[PDB]
């Protein structure tokens, strides 16, 4: 009943959703990049975790390419040692191609976050012993011009089932990993954590989106009582 089941369930939930204007294209990396994503979940997501980092943040050159939250190609391959089959989405847009691990573009938010993590902990085993990183809403929303759309710009009628599925996924994730603290990456992620994890006996907090960054993040982490 591990994380892979949760991600697959979430993938099915997202796949059954419909989106209106201005959404022209939807990327679902949980499906087309299931293999590296599940590699990530299986290798590094073993319960229990103490702190759960939650992203909101699929970017086109990060998780959209590698299936790993904040997953810049370079850090996913070199540091996490993750390889996988990544097929192109049915709704792929020319301006935002999914080249997978062949992708030459760098996701610098992911680069900064994971680089920071690698700095602090050195090896993945040290970090993932106590920590994990998850994406709250792993869909990518694009316009006909290939411009990025964020979930807050969706209509409530469409936004509600989306957040229902995502909230469900996050709840299951928290139940499974049993974290002491759930830390949103950015205030928006924290807000969603907050609603999703309403009745939960867990501490919710946030670090500054990546987006002195490292110093601010460190202070926020210290205030949440987590040694980093």
mmCIF file with all atom_site columns, C-alpha atoms in Angstrom:
data_model
loop_
_atom_site.group_PDB
_atom_site.id
_atom_site.type_symbol
_atom_site.label_atom_id
_atom_site.label_alt_id
_atom_site.label_comp_id
_atom_site.label_asym_id
_atom_site.label_entity_id
_atom_site.label_seq_id
_atom_site.pdbx_PDB_ins_code
_atom_site.Cartn_x
_atom_site.Cartn_y
_atom_site.Cartn_z
_atom_site.occupancy
_atom_site.B_iso_or_equiv
_atom_site.pdbx_formal_charge
_atom_site.auth_seq_id
_atom_site.auth_comp_id
_atom_site.auth_asym_id
_atom_site.auth_atom_id
_atom_site.pdbx_PDB_model_num
ATOM 1   C CA . UNK A 1 1   ? 0.000   0.000  0.000   1.00 0.00 ? 1   UNK A CA 1
ATOM 2   C CA . UNK A 1 2   ? 3.087   2.174  -0.487  1.00 0.00 ? 2   UNK A CA 1
ATOM 3   C CA . UNK A 1 3   ? 3.639   5.552  -2.145  1.00 0.00 ? 3   UNK A CA 1
ATOM 4   C CA . UNK A 1 4   ? 3.444   4.089  -5.656  1.00 0.00 ? 4   UNK A CA 1
ATOM 5   C CA . UNK A 1 5   ? -0.194  3.136  -5.100  1.00 0.00 ? 5   UNK A CA 1
ATOM 6   C CA . UNK A 1 6   ? -0.921  6.676  -3.923  1.00 0.00 ? 6   UNK A CA 1
ATOM 7   C CA . UNK A 1 7   ? 0.753   8.217  -6.980  1.00 0.00 ? 7   UNK A CA 1
ATOM 8   C CA . UNK A 1 8   ? -1.010  5.827  -9.369  1.00 0.00 ? 8   UNK A CA 1
ATOM 9   C CA . UNK A 1 9   ? -4.361  6.590  -7.730  1.00 0.00 ? 9   UNK A CA 1
ATOM 10  C CA . UNK A 1 10  ? -3.648  10.314 -7.999  1.00 0.00 ? 10  UNK A CA 1
ATOM 11  C CA . UNK A 1 11  ? -2.680  9.844  -11.652 1.00 0.00 ? 11  UNK A CA 1
ATOM 12  C CA . UNK A 1 12  ? -5.990  8.117  -12.345 1.00 0.00 ? 12  UNK A CA 1
ATOM 13  C CA . UNK A 1 13  ? -7.837  10.899 -10.513 1.00 0.00 ? 13  UNK A CA 1
ATOM 14  C CA . UNK A 1 14  ? -6.096  13.657 -12.489 1.00 0.00 ? 14  UNK A CA 1
ATOM 15  C CA . UNK A 1 15  ? -6.588  11.781 -15.763 1.00 0.00 ? 15  UNK A CA 1
ATOM 16  C CA . UNK A 1 16  ? -10.342 11.803 -15.166 1.00 0.00 ? 16  UNK A CA 1
ATOM 17  C CA . UNK A 1 17  ? -10.481 15.585 -14.823 1.00 0.00 ? 17  UNK A CA 1
ATOM 18  C CA . UNK A 1 18  ? -11.533 18.097 -17.474 1.00 0.00 ? 18  UNK A CA 1
ATOM 19  C CA . UNK A 1 19  ? -10.188 21.622 -17.953 1.00 0.00 ? 19  UNK A CA 1
ATOM 20  C CA . UNK A 1 20  ? -11.581 24.608 -19.856 1.00 0.00 ? 20  UNK A CA 1
ATOM 21  C CA . UNK A 1 21  ? -10.120 27.796 -21.324 1.00 0.00 ? 21  UNK A CA 1
ATOM 22  C CA . UNK A 1 22  ? -7.447  28.955 -21.099 1.00 0.00 ? 22  UNK A CA 1
ATOM 23  C CA . UNK A 1 23  ? -6.132  25.409 -20.554 1.00 0.00 ? 23  UNK A CA 1
ATOM 24  C CA . UNK A 1 24  ? -5.221  23.902 -23.919 1.00 0.00 ? 24  UNK A CA 1
ATOM 25  C CA . UNK A 1 25  ? -2.715  21.266 -22.789 1.00 0.00 ? 25  UNK A CA 1
ATOM 26  C CA . UNK A 1 26  ? -2.283  19.132 -19.667 1.00 0.00 ? 26  UNK A CA 1
ATOM 27  C CA . UNK A 1 27  ? 0.878   17.207 -18.788 1.00 0.00 ? 27  UNK A CA 1
ATOM 28  C CA . UNK A 1 28  ? 0.509   14.293 -16.374 1.00 0.00 ? 28  UNK A CA 1
ATOM 29  C CA . UNK A 1 29  ? 4.067   13.165 -15.459 1.00 0.00 ? 29  UNK A CA 1
ATOM 30  C CA . UNK A 1 30  ? 2.673   10.564 -13.059 1.00 0.00 ? 30  UNK A CA 1
ATOM 31  C CA . UNK A 1 31  ? 1.611   8.681  -16.195 1.00 0.00 ? 31  UNK A CA 1
ATOM 32  C CA . UNK A 1 32  ? 4.196   9.377  -18.904 1.00 0.00 ? 32  UNK A CA 1
ATOM 33  C CA . UNK A 1 33  ? 7.084   9.526  -16.435 1.00 0.00 ? 33  UNK A CA 1
ATOM 34  C CA . UNK A 1 34  ? 5.743   6.887  -14.052 1.00 0.00 ? 34  UNK A CA 1
ATOM 35  C CA . UNK A 1 35  ? 8.966   4.877  -14.212 1.00 0.00 ? 35  UNK A CA 1
ATOM 36  C CA . UNK A 1 36  ? 11.472  7.432  -12.863 1.00 0.00 ? 36  UNK A CA 1
ATOM 37  C CA . UNK A 1 37  ? 8.817   8.791  -10.481 1.00 0.00 ? 37  UNK A CA 1
ATOM 38  C CA . UNK A 1 38  ? 8.195   5.348  -8.997  1.00 0.00 ? 38  UNK A CA 1
ATOM 39  C CA . UNK A 1 39  ? 11.949  4.825  -8.893  1.00 0.00 ? 39  UNK A CA 1
ATOM 40  C CA . UNK A 1 40  ? 12.066  7.954  -6.722  1.00 0.00 ? 40  UNK A CA 1
ATOM 41  C CA . UNK A 1 41  ? 9.165   6.835  -4.505  1.00 0.00 ? 41  UNK A CA 1
ATOM 42  C CA . UNK A 1 42  ? 10.462  3.300  -4.004  1.00 0.00 ? 42  UNK A CA 1
ATOM 43  C CA . UNK A 1 43  ? 14.135  4.110  -3.482  1.00 0.00 ? 43  UNK A CA 1
ATOM 44  C CA . UNK A 1 44  ? 13.833  7.246  -1.357  1.00 0.00 ? 44  UNK A CA 1
ATOM 45  C CA . UNK A 1 45  ? 10.292  7.349  0.044   1.00 0.00 ? 45  UNK A CA 1
ATOM 46  C CA . UNK A 1 46  ? 10.338  4.522  2.599   1.00 0.00 ? 46  UNK A CA 1
ATOM 47  C CA . UNK A 1 47  ? 8.394   5.290  5.808   1.00 0.00 ? 47  UNK A CA 1
ATOM 48  C CA . UNK A 1 48  ? 8.721   6.681  8.320   1.00 0.00 ? 48  UNK A CA 1
ATOM 49  C CA . UNK A 1 49  ? 9.687   10.264 7.511   1.00 0.00 ? 49  UNK A CA 1
ATOM 50  C CA . UNK A 1 50  ? 9.994   13.007 10.085  1.00 0.00 ? 50  UNK A CA 1
ATOM 51  C CA . UNK A 1 51  ? 9.554   16.013 7.754   1.00 0.00 ? 51  UNK A CA 1
ATOM 52  C CA . UNK A 1 52  ? 7.576   16.046 4.494   1.00 0.00 ? 52  UNK A CA 1
ATOM 53  C CA . UNK A 1 53  ? 8.379   18.763 1.977   1.00 0.00 ? 53  UNK A CA 1
ATOM 54  C CA . UNK A 1 54  ? 5.421   19.428 -0.283  1.00 0.00 ? 54  UNK A CA 1
ATOM 55  C CA . UNK A 1 55  ? 5.783   21.190 -3.580  1.00 0.00 ? 55  UNK A CA 1
ATOM 56  C CA . UNK A 1 56  ? 3.074   22.837 -5.613  1.00 0.00 ? 56  UNK A CA 1
ATOM 57  C CA . UNK A 1 57  ? 5.551   23.246 -8.296  1.00 0.00 ? 57  UNK A CA 1
ATOM 58  C CA . UNK A 1 58  ? 5.699   21.225 -11.461 1.00 0.00 ? 58  UNK A CA 1
ATOM 59  C CA . UNK A 1 59  ? 7.842   23.234 -13.856 1.00 0.00 ? 59  UNK A CA 1
ATOM 60  C CA . UNK A 1 60  ? 8.317   22.240 -17.477 1.00 0.00 ? 60  UNK A CA 1
ATOM 61  C CA . UNK A 1 61  ? 12.018  21.393 -17.173 1.00 0.00 ? 61  UNK A CA 1
ATOM 62  C CA . UNK A 1 62  ? 11.758  19.721 -13.768 1.00 0.00 ? 62  UNK A CA 1
ATOM 63  C CA . UNK A 1 63  ? 9.202   17.102 -12.761 1.00 0.00 ? 63  UNK A CA 1
ATOM 64  C CA . UNK A 1 64  ? 7.573   17.424 -16.182 1.00 0.00 ? 64  UNK A CA 1
ATOM 65  C CA . UNK A 1 65  ? 10.760  15.951 -17.656 1.00 0.00 ? 65  UNK A CA 1
ATOM 66  C CA . UNK A 1 66  ? 11.861  13.562 -14.915 1.00 0.00 ? 66  UNK A CA 1
ATOM 67  C CA . UNK A 1 67  ? 8.768   12.742 -12.848 1.00 0.00 ? 67  UNK A CA 1
ATOM 68  C CA . UNK A 1 68  ? 10.645  13.773 -9.711  1.00 0.00 ? 68  UNK A CA 1
ATOM 69  C CA . UNK A 1 69  ? 9.349   16.726 -7.658  1.00 0.00 ? 69  UNK A CA 1
ATOM 70  C CA . UNK A 1 70  ? 11.630  19.726 -8.282  1.00 0.00 ? 70  UNK A CA 1
ATOM 71  C CA . UNK A 1 71  ? 13.471  17.179 -10.384 1.00 0.00 ? 71  UNK A CA 1
ATOM 72  C CA . UNK A 1 72  ? 16.121  18.946 -12.412 1.00 0.00 ? 72  UNK A CA 1
ATOM 73  C CA . UNK A 1 73  ? 17.611  16.445 -14.865 1.00 0.00 ? 73  UNK A CA 1
ATOM 74  C CA . UNK A 1 74  ? 21.171  16.938 -13.623 1.00 0.00 ? 74  UNK A CA 1
ATOM 75  C CA . UNK A 1 75  ? 20.478  16.378 -9.923  1.00 0.00 ? 75  UNK A CA 1
ATOM 76  C CA . UNK A 1 76  ? 18.048  13.514 -10.599 1.00 0.00 ? 76  UNK A CA 1
ATOM 77  C CA . UNK A 1 77  ? 20.563  11.611 -12.731 1.00 0.00 ? 77  UNK A CA 1
ATOM 78  C CA . UNK A 1 78  ? 23.854  12.492 -11.026 1.00 0.00 ? 78  UNK A CA 1
ATOM 79  C CA . UNK A 1 79  ? 22.806  12.689 -7.369  1.00 0.00 ? 79  UNK A CA 1
ATOM 80  C CA . UNK A 1 80  ? 19.664  10.561 -7.102  1.00 0.00 ? 80  UNK A CA 1
ATOM 81  C CA . UNK A 1 81  ? 20.974  8.125  -9.704  1.00 0.00 ? 81  UNK A CA 1
ATOM 82  C CA . UNK A 1 82  ? 17.585  7.845  -11.365 1.00 0.00 ? 82  UNK A CA 1
ATOM 83  C CA . UNK A 1 83  ? 17.078  6.553  -14.898 1.00 0.00 ? 83  UNK A CA 1
ATOM 84  C CA . UNK A 1 84  ? 13.799  5.843  -16.644 1.00 0.00 ? 84  UNK A CA 1
ATOM 85  C CA . UNK A 1 85  ? 11.458  5.648  -19.595 1.00 0.00 ? 85  UNK A CA 1
ATOM 86  C CA . UNK A 1 86  ? 9.817   9.005  -20.224 1.00 0.00 ? 86  UNK A CA 1
ATOM 87  C CA . UNK A 1 87  ? 7.324   9.101  -23.073 1.00 0.00 ? 87  UNK A CA 1
ATOM 88  C CA . UNK A 1 88  ? 5.853   12.287 -24.494 1.00 0.00 ? 88  UNK A CA 1
ATOM 89  C CA . UNK A 1 89  ? 2.395   13.383 -23.303 1.00 0.00 ? 89  UNK A CA 1
ATOM 90  C CA . UNK A 1 90  ? -0.468  12.981 -25.771 1.00 0.00 ? 90  UNK A CA 1
ATOM 91  C CA . UNK A 1 91  ? -1.080  16.702 -25.359 1.00 0.00 ? 91  UNK A CA 1
ATOM 92  C CA . UNK A 1 92  ? 2.559   17.750 -25.787 1.00 0.00 ? 92  UNK A CA 1
ATOM 93  C CA . UNK A 1 93  ? 3.168   21.319 -26.955 1.00 0.00 ? 93  UNK A CA 1
ATOM 94  C CA . UNK A 1 94  ? 6.066   22.234 -29.308 1.00 0.00 ? 94  UNK A CA 1
ATOM 95  C CA . UNK A 1 95  ? 7.331   25.071 -27.085 1.00 0.00 ? 95  UNK A CA 1
ATOM 96  C CA . UNK A 1 96  ? 7.458   22.741 -24.075 1.00 0.00 ? 96  UNK A CA 1
ATOM 97  C CA . UNK A 1 97  ? 8.737   19.396 -25.339 1.00 0.00 ? 97  UNK A CA 1
ATOM 98  C CA . UNK A 1 98  ? 9.198   16.490 -22.938 1.00 0.00 ? 98  UNK A CA 1
ATOM 99  C CA . UNK A 1 99  ? 12.633  15.117 -23.781 1.00 0.00 ? 99  UNK A CA 1
ATOM 100 C CA . UNK A 1 100 ? 12.844  13.325 -20.445 1.00 0.00 ? 100 UNK A CA 1
ATOM 101 C CA . UNK A 1 101 ? 16.392  12.784 -19.228 1.00 0.00 ? 101 UNK A CA 1
ATOM 102 C CA . UNK A 1 102 ? 17.576  13.903 -22.668 1.00 0.00 ? 102 UNK A CA 1
ATOM 103 C CA . UNK A 1 103 ? 16.246  17.367 -21.773 1.00 0.00 ? 103 UNK A CA 1
ATOM 104 C CA . UNK A 1 104 ? 19.016  19.966 -21.949 1.00 0.00 ? 104 UNK A CA 1
ATOM 105 C CA . UNK A 1 105 ? 17.021  22.638 -20.103 1.00 0.00 ? 105 UNK A CA 1
ATOM 106 C CA . UNK A 1 106 ? 17.658  23.105 -16.382 1.00 0.00 ? 106 UNK A CA 1
ATOM 107 C CA . UNK A 1 107 ? 14.991  23.615 -13.705 1.00 0.00 ? 107 UNK A CA 1
ATOM 108 C CA . UNK A 1 108 ? 16.849  26.097 -11.486 1.00 0.00 ? 108 UNK A CA 1
ATOM 109 C CA . UNK A 1 109 ? 14.258  26.077 -8.709  1.00 0.00 ? 109 UNK A CA 1
ATOM 110 C CA . UNK A 1 110 ? 14.809  22.325 -8.505  1.00 0.00 ? 110 UNK A CA 1
ATOM 111 C CA . UNK A 1 111 ? 18.532  22.871 -8.962  1.00 0.00 ? 111 UNK A CA 1
ATOM 112 C CA . UNK A 1 112 ? 18.618  25.296 -6.056  1.00 0.00 ? 112 UNK A CA 1
ATOM 113 C CA . UNK A 1 113 ? 16.425  23.195 -3.765  1.00 0.00 ? 113 UNK A CA 1
ATOM 114 C CA . UNK A 1 114 ? 18.107  19.842 -4.410  1.00 0.00 ? 114 UNK A CA 1
ATOM 115 C CA . UNK A 1 115 ? 21.557  21.434 -4.556  1.00 0.00 ? 115 UNK A CA 1
ATOM 116 C CA . UNK A 1 116 ? 20.851  22.960 -1.161  1.00 0.00 ? 116 UNK A CA 1
ATOM 117 C CA . UNK A 1 117 ? 19.720  19.566 0.130   1.00 0.00 ? 117 UNK A CA 1
ATOM 118 C CA . UNK A 1 118 ? 22.828  17.826 -1.277  1.00 0.00 ? 118 UNK A CA 1
ATOM 119 C CA . UNK A 1 119 ? 24.956  20.496 0.333   1.00 0.00 ? 119 UNK A CA 1
ATOM 120 C CA . UNK A 1 120 ? 23.380  20.000 3.743   1.00 0.00 ? 120 UNK A CA 1
ATOM 121 C CA . UNK A 1 121 ? 23.278  16.174 3.665   1.00 0.00 ? 121 UNK A CA 1
ATOM 122 C CA . UNK A 1 122 ? 25.893  14.948 1.159   1.00 0.00 ? 122 UNK A CA 1
ATOM 123 C CA . UNK A 1 123 ? 24.262  11.596 0.365   1.00 0.00 ? 123 UNK A CA 1
ATOM 124 C CA . UNK A 1 124 ? 20.595  10.859 -0.492  1.00 0.00 ? 124 UNK A CA 1
ATOM 125 C CA . UNK A 1 125 ? 20.451  8.285  2.326   1.00 0.00 ? 125 UNK A CA 1
ATOM 126 C CA . UNK A 1 126 ? 21.215  10.893 4.997   1.00 0.00 ? 126 UNK A CA 1
ATOM 127 C CA . UNK A 1 127 ? 18.473  13.219 3.737   1.00 0.00 ? 127 UNK A CA 1
ATOM 128 C CA . UNK A 1 128 ? 15.763  10.673 2.940   1.00 0.00 ? 128 UNK A CA 1
ATOM 129 C CA . UNK A 1 129 ? 16.312  9.004  6.310   1.00 0.00 ? 129 UNK A CA 1
ATOM 130 C CA . UNK A 1 130 ? 14.229  11.799 7.836   1.00 0.00 ? 130 UNK A CA 1
ATOM 131 C CA . UNK A 1 131 ? 12.906  13.764 4.865   1.00 0.00 ? 131 UNK A CA 1
ATOM 132 C CA . UNK A 1 132 ? 10.892  13.451 1.675   1.00 0.00 ? 132 UNK A CA 1
ATOM 133 C CA . UNK A 1 133 ? 9.774   15.743 -1.139  1.00 0.00 ? 133 UNK A CA 1
ATOM 134 C CA . UNK A 1 134 ? 6.367   15.487 -2.794  1.00 0.00 ? 134 UNK A CA 1
ATOM 135 C CA . UNK A 1 135 ? 4.407   17.451 -5.381  1.00 0.00 ? 135 UNK A CA 1
ATOM 136 C CA . UNK A 1 136 ? 0.883   18.473 -4.346  1.00 0.00 ? 136 UNK A CA 1
ATOM 137 C CA . UNK A 1 137 ? -0.402  19.056 -7.878  1.00 0.00 ? 137 UNK A CA 1
ATOM 138 C CA . UNK A 1 138 ? 1.822   17.357 -10.467 1.00 0.00 ? 138 UNK A CA 1
ATOM 139 C CA . UNK A 1 139 ? -0.125  18.482 -13.562 1.00 0.00 ? 139 UNK A CA 1
ATOM 140 C CA . UNK A 1 140 ? 1.308   21.023 -15.995 1.00 0.00 ? 140 UNK A CA 1
ATOM 141 C CA . UNK A 1 141 ? -1.215  23.440 -17.507 1.00 0.00 ? 141 UNK A CA 1
ATOM 142 C CA . UNK A 1 142 ? -0.410  25.141 -20.811 1.00 0.00 ? 142 UNK A CA 1
ATOM 143 C CA . UNK A 1 143 ? -2.146  27.603 -23.129 1.00 0.00 ? 143 UNK A CA 1
ATOM 144 C CA . UNK A 1 144 ? -2.261  27.237 -26.914 1.00 0.00 ? 144 UNK A CA 1
ATOM 145 C CA . UNK A 1 145 ? 0.889   29.377 -27.010 1.00 0.00 ? 145 UNK A CA 1
ATOM 146 C CA . UNK A 1 146 ? 2.501   26.999 -24.523 1.00 0.00 ? 146 UNK A CA 1
ATOM 147 C CA . UNK A 1 147 ? 2.362   29.477 -21.658 1.00 0.00 ? 147 UNK A CA 1
ATOM 148 C CA . UNK A 1 148 ? 2.284   28.133 -18.106 1.00 0.00 ? 148 UNK A CA 1
ATOM 149 C CA . UNK A 1 149 ? -0.989  28.210 -16.171 1.00 0.00 ? 149 UNK A CA 1
ATOM 150 C CA . UNK A 1 150 ? -1.089  27.872 -12.387 1.00 0.00 ? 150 UNK A CA 1
ATOM 151 C CA . UNK A 1 151 ? -4.031  26.169 -10.580 1.00 0.00 ? 151 UNK A CA 1
ATOM 152 C CA . UNK A 1 152 ? -5.209  29.414 -8.937  1.00 0.00 ? 152 UNK A CA 1
ATOM 153 C CA . UNK A 1 153 ? -6.197  30.684 -12.397 1.00 0.00 ? 153 UNK A CA 1
ATOM 154 C CA . UNK A 1 154 ? -8.555  27.746 -12.931 1.00 0.00 ? 154 UNK A CA 1
ATOM 155 C CA . UNK A 1 155 ? -12.287 28.170 -12.331 1.00 0.00 ? 155 UNK A CA 1
ATOM 156 C CA . UNK A 1 156 ? -13.717 26.960 -9.013  1.00 0.00 ? 156 UNK A CA 1
ATOM 157 C CA . UNK A 1 157 ? -15.885 24.351 -10.742 1.00 0.00 ? 157 UNK A CA 1
ATOM 158 C CA . UNK A 1 158 ? -12.755 22.773 -12.224 1.00 0.00 ? 158 UNK A CA 1
ATOM 159 C CA . UNK A 1 159 ? -10.397 23.746 -9.396  1.00 0.00 ? 159 UNK A CA 1
ATOM 160 C CA . UNK A 1 160 ? -12.486 21.934 -6.783  1.00 0.00 ? 160 UNK A CA 1
ATOM 161 C CA . UNK A 1 161 ? -12.212 18.348 -8.079  1.00 0.00 ? 161 UNK A CA 1
ATOM 162 C CA . UNK A 1 162 ? -8.518  18.937 -8.836  1.00 0.00 ? 162 UNK A CA 1
ATOM 163 C CA . UNK A 1 163 ? -7.822  20.007 -5.270  1.00 0.00 ? 163 UNK A CA 1
ATOM 164 C CA . UNK A 1 164 ? -10.082 17.220 -4.016  1.00 0.00 ? 164 UNK A CA 1
ATOM 165 C CA . UNK A 1 165 ? -7.908  14.591 -5.684  1.00 0.00 ? 165 UNK A CA 1
ATOM 166 C CA . UNK A 1 166 ? -4.653  16.313 -4.732  1.00 0.00 ? 166 UNK A CA 1
ATOM 167 C CA . UNK A 1 167 ? -5.799  16.771 -1.112  1.00 0.00 ? 167 UNK A CA 1
ATOM 168 C CA . UNK A 1 168 ? -6.722  13.091 -0.977  1.00 0.00 ? 168 UNK A CA 1
ATOM 169 C CA . UNK A 1 169 ? -3.293  12.100 -2.305  1.00 0.00 ? 169 UNK A CA 1
ATOM 170 C CA . UNK A 1 170 ? -1.525  14.340 0.213   1.00 0.00 ? 170 UNK A CA 1
ATOM 171 C CA . UNK A 1 171 ? -3.594  13.001 3.107   1.00 0.00 ? 171 UNK A CA 1
ATOM 172 C CA . UNK A 1 172 ? -2.738  9.422  2.138   1.00 0.00 ? 172 UNK A CA 1
ATOM 173 C CA . UNK A 1 173 ? 0.933   10.387 1.803   1.00 0.00 ? 173 UNK A CA 1
ATOM 174 C CA . UNK A 1 174 ? 0.977   11.938 5.282   1.00 0.00 ? 174 UNK A CA 1
ATOM 175 C CA . UNK A 1 175 ? -0.823  8.925  6.764   1.00 0.00 ? 175 UNK A CA 1
ATOM 176 C CA . UNK A 1 176 ? 1.752   6.594  5.204   1.00 0.00 ? 176 UNK A CA 1
ATOM 177 C CA . UNK A 1 177 ? 4.966   8.498  5.960   1.00 0.00 ? 177 UNK A CA 1
ATOM 178 C CA . UNK A 1 178 ? 3.831   9.642  9.423   1.00 0.00 ? 178 UNK A CA 1
ATOM 179 C CA . UNK A 1 179 ? 5.706   12.969 9.399   1.00 0.00 ? 179 UNK A CA 1
ATOM 180 C CA . UNK A 1 180 ? 6.012   15.259 12.421  1.00 0.00 ? 180 UNK A CA 1
ATOM 181 C CA . UNK A 1 181 ? 6.009   18.334 10.200  1.00 0.00 ? 181 UNK A CA 1
ATOM 182 C CA . UNK A 1 182 ? 4.639   19.090 6.746   1.00 0.00 ? 182 UNK A CA 1
ATOM 183 C CA . UNK A 1 183 ? 6.498   21.937 5.075   1.00 0.00 ? 183 UNK A CA 1
ATOM 184 C CA . UNK A 1 184 ? 5.022   23.677 2.055   1.00 0.00 ? 184 UNK A CA 1
ATOM 185 C CA . UNK A 1 185 ? 7.416   24.994 -0.562  1.00 0.00 ? 185 UNK A CA 1
ATOM 186 C CA . UNK A 1 186 ? 6.035   28.499 -0.921  1.00 0.00 ? 186 UNK A CA 1
ATOM 187 C CA . UNK A 1 187 ? 2.980   29.961 0.811   1.00 0.00 ? 187 UNK A CA 1
ATOM 188 C CA . UNK A 1 188 ? 0.559   28.557 -1.773  1.00 0.00 ? 188 UNK A CA 1
ATOM 189 C CA . UNK A 1 189 ? 1.746   24.985 -1.165  1.00 0.00 ? 189 UNK A CA 1
ATOM 190 C CA . UNK A 1 190 ? 1.470   25.603 2.591   1.00 0.00 ? 190 UNK A CA 1
ATOM 191 C CA . UNK A 1 191 ? -2.101  26.843 2.167   1.00 0.00 ? 191 UNK A CA 1
ATOM 192 C CA . UNK A 1 192 ? -3.067  23.681 0.316   1.00 0.00 ? 192 UNK A CA 1
ATOM 193 C CA . UNK A 1 193 ? -1.319  21.554 3.011   1.00 0.00 ? 193 UNK A CA 1
ATOM 194 C CA . UNK A 1 194 ? -3.311  23.430 5.598   1.00 0.00 ? 194 UNK A CA 1
ATOM 195 C CA . UNK A 1 195 ? -6.687  22.736 3.985   1.00 0.00 ? 195 UNK A CA 1
ATOM 196 C CA . UNK A 1 196 ? -5.884  19.126 3.021   1.00 0.00 ? 196 UNK A CA 1
ATOM 197 C CA . UNK A 1 197 ? -4.437  18.256 6.434   1.00 0.00 ? 197 UNK A CA 1
ATOM 198 C CA . UNK A 1 198 ? -7.142  20.061 8.435   1.00 0.00 ? 198 UNK A CA 1
ATOM 199 C CA . UNK A 1 199 ? -7.974  17.473 11.117  1.00 0.00 ? 199 UNK A CA 1
ATOM 200 C CA . UNK A 1 200 ? -4.440  16.085 11.273  1.00 0.00 ? 200 UNK A CA 1
ATOM 201 C CA . UNK A 1 201 ? -2.155  16.120 14.325  1.00 0.00 ? 201 UNK A CA 1
ATOM 202 C CA . UNK A 1 202 ? 0.807   17.421 12.349  1.00 0.00 ? 202 UNK A CA 1
ATOM 203 C CA . UNK A 1 203 ? 2.740   20.671 12.235  1.00 0.00 ? 203 UNK A CA 1
ATOM 204 C CA . UNK A 1 204 ? 2.414   22.603 9.028   1.00 0.00 ? 204 UNK A CA 1
ATOM 205 C CA . UNK A 1 205 ? 4.939   25.241 7.995   1.00 0.00 ? 205 UNK A CA 1
ATOM 206 C CA . UNK A 1 206 ? 6.771   26.560 4.954   1.00 0.00 ? 206 UNK A CA 1
ATOM 207 C CA . UNK A 1 207 ? 10.132  27.504 3.511   1.00 0.00 ? 207 UNK A CA 1
ATOM 208 C CA . UNK A 1 208 ? 10.657  30.316 1.005   1.00 0.00 ? 208 UNK A CA 1
ATOM 209 C CA . UNK A 1 209 ? 10.187  29.209 -2.619  1.00 0.00 ? 209 UNK A CA 1
ATOM 210 C CA . UNK A 1 210 ? 13.653  28.943 -4.312  1.00 0.00 ? 210 UNK A CA 1
ATOM 211 C CA . UNK A 1 211 ? 11.785  30.263 -6.407  1.00 0.00 ? 211 UNK A CA 1
ATOM 212 C CA . UNK A 1 212 ? 19.630  35.125 1.132   1.00 0.00 ? 212 UNK A CA 1
ATOM 213 C CA . UNK A 1 213 ? 17.478  32.146 0.118   1.00 0.00 ? 213 UNK A CA 1
ATOM 214 C CA . UNK A 1 214 ? 19.464  29.468 1.915   1.00 0.00 ? 214 UNK A CA 1
ATOM 215 C CA . UNK A 1 215 ? 19.708  31.592 5.055   1.00 0.00 ? 215 UNK A CA 1
ATOM 216 C CA . UNK A 1 216 ? 15.992  32.379 5.095   1.00 0.00 ? 216 UNK A CA 1
ATOM 217 C CA . UNK A 1 217 ? 15.101  28.735 4.491   1.00 0.00 ? 217 UNK A CA 1
ATOM 218 C CA . UNK A 1 218 ? 17.496  27.743 7.285   1.00 0.00 ? 218 UNK A CA 1
ATOM 219 C CA . UNK A 1 219 ? 15.884  30.177 9.725   1.00 0.00 ? 219 UNK A CA 1
ATOM 220 C CA . UNK A 1 220 ? 12.381  28.979 8.814   1.00 0.00 ? 220 UNK A CA 1
ATOM 221 C CA . UNK A 1 221 ? 13.488  25.359 9.254   1.00 0.00 ? 221 UNK A CA 1
ATOM 222 C CA . UNK A 1 222 ? 15.052  26.179 12.626  1.00 0.00 ? 222 UNK A CA 1
ATOM 223 C CA . UNK A 1 223 ? 11.786  27.834 13.686  1.00 0.00 ? 223 UNK A CA 1
ATOM 224 C CA . UNK A 1 224 ? 9.912   24.670 12.736  1.00 0.00 ? 224 UNK A CA 1
ATOM 225 C CA . UNK A 1 225 ? 12.322  22.829 15.015  1.00 0.00 ? 225 UNK A CA 1
ATOM 226 C CA . UNK A 1 226 ? 13.989  20.759 12.310  1.00 0.00 ? 226 UNK A CA 1
ATOM 227 C CA . UNK A 1 227 ? 17.753  20.222 12.241  1.00 0.00 ? 227 UNK A CA 1
ATOM 228 C CA . UNK A 1 228 ? 18.980  20.608 8.668   1.00 0.00 ? 228 UNK A CA 1
#
